[PDB]
Design a protein around this ligand. Structure first.
Ligand SMILES: Cn1nc(CC(=O)N2CC(C(N)=O)C2)c2ccccc21
Ligand SMILES: [Zn+2]
Length: 140
């Protein structure tokens, strides 16, 4: 589990969104595994606006933050899980690292701020849903 709290937005994995998230929906995209809902309080996270390929992510199944090198956001084939059939997921970045299903939501960050959240995993891989192209998170 986990979310990004920027401005009056809450960014979560679409597959982990709650009823309150769907009832206060701003935007969702199943191909990216992302959903954004509105919040009453302002958040403290800052979004990175950069092309970094190195950063650090939080792994809840290890209680640890790990430094990683990650690929550029792309269209990647992801195996079937409890939440999606086997399919192509867009705006996804891969790194070598530990991930279990419940690790979804952990933040990946670089020197500029939040880059994305854990979305996929398996066999020493971890996938991150990028948010750096969502410029509207910084306004309204
Ligand atoms: C974080 N992660 N995820 C999965 C499968 C899963 O629940 N999916 C893949 C997610 C998606 N965005 O399509 C939903 C896994 C399987 C072993 C290890 C780590 C893992
Ligand atoms: Zn950066």
């Amino acid at each position: 589990s986990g979310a990004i709290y920027v401005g009056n937005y809450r960014v979560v994995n679409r597959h982990l969104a709650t009823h309150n998230d769907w009832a206060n929906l701003v935007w969702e995209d199943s191909s990216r595994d992302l959903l954004v809902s509105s919040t009453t309080a302002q958040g403290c996270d800052t979004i990175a606006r950069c092309d970094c390929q190195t950063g650090v992510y939080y792994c809840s199944s290890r209680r640890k933050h790990y430094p990683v090198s990650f690929s550029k956001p792309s269209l990647i084939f992801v195996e079937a899980s409890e939440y999606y059939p086997a399919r192509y997921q867009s705006h996804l970045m891969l790194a070598v690292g530990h991930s279990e299903p419940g690790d979804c939501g952990g933040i990946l960050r670089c020197q500029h701020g939040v880059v994305g959240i854990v979305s996929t995993g398996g066999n020493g891989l971890v996938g991150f849903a990028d948010v750096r192209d969502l410029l509207w998170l910084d306004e309204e």
